[PDB]
Design a protein around this ligand. Structure first.
Ligand SMILES: OC[C@H]1O[C@@H](O[C@@H]2[C@@H](O)[C@H](O)O[C@H](CO)[C@H]2O)[C@H](O)[C@@H](O)[C@@H]1O
Ligand SMILES: OC[C@H]1O[C@@H](O[C@@H]2[C@@H](O)[C@H](O)O[C@H](CO)[C@H]2O)[C@H](O)[C@@H](O)[C@@H]1O
Length: 752
């Protein structure tokens, strides 16, 4: 066979002969392919190749595209490594009124080029090593080699030379304001402040000219926060400690809900006595959550301005952040003041819904929709309908989770395949370049895990490894593997340091990598929490908890700017739709209207969505701005998503809008998402808004000693919600002294 058996399921090991289903569209057909054959990595990098990284273009392009190892941007070329910093004069905020788009971006310039004395014509740049957030790029020309070590959160670039020495080349002569022989402080013609470091005795030459040279086979470059010799002296201390290892280790304390992450480097000395450590540049989502024991390592005045706001300097081997996991739910409970017969009707209406495509994404949206309806059907006493939805889920997954047909041949569609070259599970039919660019695996597979988590909630037997569980856990491994996974790189999607996932597998853009729907990422993480809890997989659960909680911290900074500190004042919208390494867009990957540029970071609504309601002033600010722009509450598209979002702070208003318009159209209509977004239903919309109306506001100030919970607060009156996935009753302690007993396989309140 060209298939590997996993419990009752299987994946392909040879590329299937695709069933194109008579579709001739060149786009659709090109989608049904594989990621690039050529990987630019040396023979030192073996095993499943890392993807979905800030540095991906180094691996995919012969050289690289523009990359953002903050505070720097860099790019590999035949001539060497171009180095740049966006100063305020490089930054712009542009609006296209007719498109309804905004762009915050810098420039693709060159402050200087780091060069090798022996060649300006390297053949390629390869990935020679990487760790949790640094990369080692190797520019290669036979005996001539230049190895560049750099990373997000590193104000150093470390440069190692073979068969040559260091050259720094400038278009306009820099100002060398400090000359210590082997160490120089310099500024570009336009006043960007840098430093360069060589070992003692290896003195810089060409001071005053456009080309600075050093005979050493090792230099470091630093971005300096200020033209300041005291800072230069501090940067000297770690300029010879090249980062070799970097690890973000975490723990989840289930009793308190605290997610603790330690970021640790291990360096190699390039001069005698070089300390084992570095100067880290911390992002807002890190330093705003800095542990007490790390506070003394801060270099208070060491600030860098970047697209994500202000970075700050911290010195040493490690630092720690502390975050609070807020819980998730399998769905909202039965606590609304809805008309029950009206909800039952909408539940039956949803039997008309069908997927709007055969690809993993459209099919994903559909199964997430069914998985969302089934607990509501249970709650309304419609157990036979709930079972129909779960049966349809089972039928869909039992199809997709087998790579072979009844005769034992590979299927042409509705299957998964292991690309060995990169080491990734791909689904066919594919879309959004999920296969050709290894894009969005969390977005797509998150919907599959949702379907499986809802099945598992009602049927533990189905979810066992030897049954359909093994294939689900394989999908999960693809997008969030642990270390030393034989088939997959570590935490594919996630960048533990930038604190968010990256959607593009290749990152071949001059803006670095990107993420549009942070909510579909949070959806993926929620679903792994639910799945792992249902199936008794503690290690997997805690990993998804760490991801959910960390991703949340990046979202509130860089998507939402809840603290009003990151977006430039002149930027009109109250959200960034797509975050890049180097820029921020109020824009979508498809041609869209006004609502979608907000709501793509809200959808889908589910039992893990309550994170969206932690900052009520933000929810109001964002809503009101979209309302201002629309000019009324007549939403251009996806009205139901707006109402559901509005319910976080004002469910009376959400109810009123809903009552006025929910029944404007009848049954599922793919051509019309004015009222109901195609991944959503009337039943979901109606259930959510009424639940929020009775419960009040999300209360993130209360934690619990178990992971599957929520706490709401209505005018000082708290409602506590727990779902118990266990065969035994549990007792849950909340952080405000409240405690509750929960029966097996049930909610504490609102089971229906
Ligand atoms: O990059 C991640 C996102 O990619 C999007 O597809 C892009 C195409 O629309 C565009 O024409 O080409 C680029 C490659 O140059 C594609 O990456 C997907 O639609 C998104 O779903 C995805 O997150
Ligand atoms: O409403 C029809 C339009 O929908 C678009 O799909 C969006 C996806 O591209 C994006 O990845 O996710 C959102 C939310 O699920 C979808 O609305 C299509 O791209 C458009 O071609 C289509 O006109």
């Amino acid at each position: 066979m060209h298939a590997v058996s996993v419990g009752k399921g299987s994946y392909a090991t040879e590329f299937p002969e695709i069933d194109f289903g008579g579709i001739n569209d060149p786009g659709f057909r090109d989608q049904q392919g594989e990621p690039p054959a050529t990987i630019y990595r040396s023979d030192r990098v073996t095993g499943p190749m890392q993807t979905n990284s800030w540095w991906g273009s180094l691996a995919v392009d012969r050289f690289s595209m523009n990359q953002y190892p903050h505070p720097f941007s860099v790019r590999h070329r035949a001539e060497g490594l171009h180095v740049f910093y966006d100063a305020p004069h490089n930054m712009v905020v542009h609006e296209n009124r007719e498109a309804g788009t905004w762009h915050i971006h810098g420039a693709i310039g060159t402050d200087f080029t780091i060069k090798h004395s022996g060649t300006a014509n390297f053949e390629q740049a390869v990935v020679d090593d990487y760790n949790d957030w640094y990369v080692r790029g190797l520019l290669e020309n036979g005996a001539h080699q230049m190895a560049i070590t750099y990373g997000v959160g590193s104000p150093y670039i470390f440069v190692e030379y073979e068969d040559g020495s260091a050259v720094l080349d400038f278009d306009i002569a820099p100002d060398v304001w400090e000359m210590n022989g082997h160490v120089i402080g310099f500024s570009t013609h336009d006043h960007k402040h840098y430093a360069a470091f060589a070992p003692p005795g290896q003195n810089w030459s060409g001071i005053g000219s456009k080309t600075l040279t050093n005979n050493a086979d090792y230099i470091a470059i630093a971005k300096l926060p200020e033209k300041d010799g005291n800072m230069l002296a501090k940067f000297e201390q770690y300029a010879y400690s090249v980062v070799r290892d970097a690890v973000a280790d975490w723990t989840y304390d289930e009793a308190t809900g605290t997610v603790t992450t330690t970021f640790e480097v291990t360096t190699e000395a390039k001069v005698q006595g070089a300390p084992d450590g570095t100067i880290f540049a911390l992002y807002p989502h890190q330093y705003r959550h800095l542990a007490s024991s790390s506070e003394n390592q801060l270099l208070q005045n060491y600030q860098y301005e970047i697209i994500r706001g202000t970075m700050i300097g911290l010195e040493g081997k490690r630092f720690t952040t502390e975050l609070t996991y807020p819980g998730v739910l399998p769905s909202l409970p039965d606590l609304g003041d809805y008309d029950r017969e009206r909800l039952i009707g909408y539940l039956h209406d949803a039997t008309s819904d069908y997927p709007t495509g055969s690809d993993t994404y459209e099919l994903g949206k559909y199964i997430g929709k069914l998985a969302t309806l089934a607990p509501i059907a249970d709650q309304m006493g419609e157990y036979e309908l709930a079972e129909q939805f779960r049966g349809e889920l089972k039928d869909i997954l039992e199809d997709w989770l087998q790579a072979t047909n009844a005769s034992g041949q590979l299927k042409g569609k509705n299957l998964f395949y292991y690309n060995e070259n990169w080491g990734t599970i791909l689904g066919y039919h594919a879309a959004h370049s999920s296969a050709t660019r290894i894009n969005d695996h969390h977005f797509h597979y998150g919907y599959f895990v949702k379907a499986a988590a809802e099945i598992a909630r009602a049927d533990q037997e189905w979810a066992k490894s030897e049954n359909w569980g093994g294939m689900i856990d394989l999908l999960i491994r693809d997008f969030m593997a642990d270390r030393d996974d034989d088939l997959f790189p570590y935490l594919r999607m996630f960048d533990p340091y930038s604190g968010n996932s990256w959607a593009d597998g290749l990152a071949t853009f001059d803006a670095g990598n990107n993420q549009e729907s942070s909510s579909e990422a949070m959806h993926a993480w929620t679903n792994v929490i639910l799945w792992a809890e249902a199936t008794g997989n503690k290690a997997l659960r805690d990993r998804a908890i760490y991801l959910y909680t960390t991703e949340m911290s990046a979202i509130n900074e860089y998507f939402f700017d809840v603290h009003q500190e990151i977006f430039p004042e002149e930027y009109g919208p109250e959200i960034v739709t797509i975050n890049w390494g180097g820029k921020m867009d109020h824009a979508t990957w498809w041609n869209s209207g006004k609502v979608e540029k907000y709501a793509i970071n809200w959808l889908p609504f589910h039992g893990g969505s309550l994170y969206l309601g932690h900052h009520p002033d933000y929810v109001d600010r964002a809503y009101e701005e979209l309302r201002r722009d629309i000019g009324s509450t007549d939403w251009n598209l996806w009205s139901n998503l707006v109402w559901m979002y509005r319910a976080f702070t004002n469910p009376d208003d959400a109810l009123q809008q809903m009552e006025a318009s929910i029944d404007d159209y009848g049954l599922f209509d793919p051509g019309n998402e004015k009222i109901i977004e195609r991944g959503s239903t009337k039943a979901q919309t109606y259930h959510w808004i009424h639940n929020l109306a009775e419960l009040g506001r999300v209360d993130p100030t209360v934690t619990a000693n178990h992971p599957i919970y929520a706490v709401f607060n209505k005018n000082g009156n708290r409602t506590y919600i727990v779902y118990n996935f266990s065969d035994s009753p549990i007792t849950v302690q909340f952080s405000d002294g409240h405690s509750i007993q929960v029966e097996p396989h049930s909610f504490n309140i609102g089971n229906g």
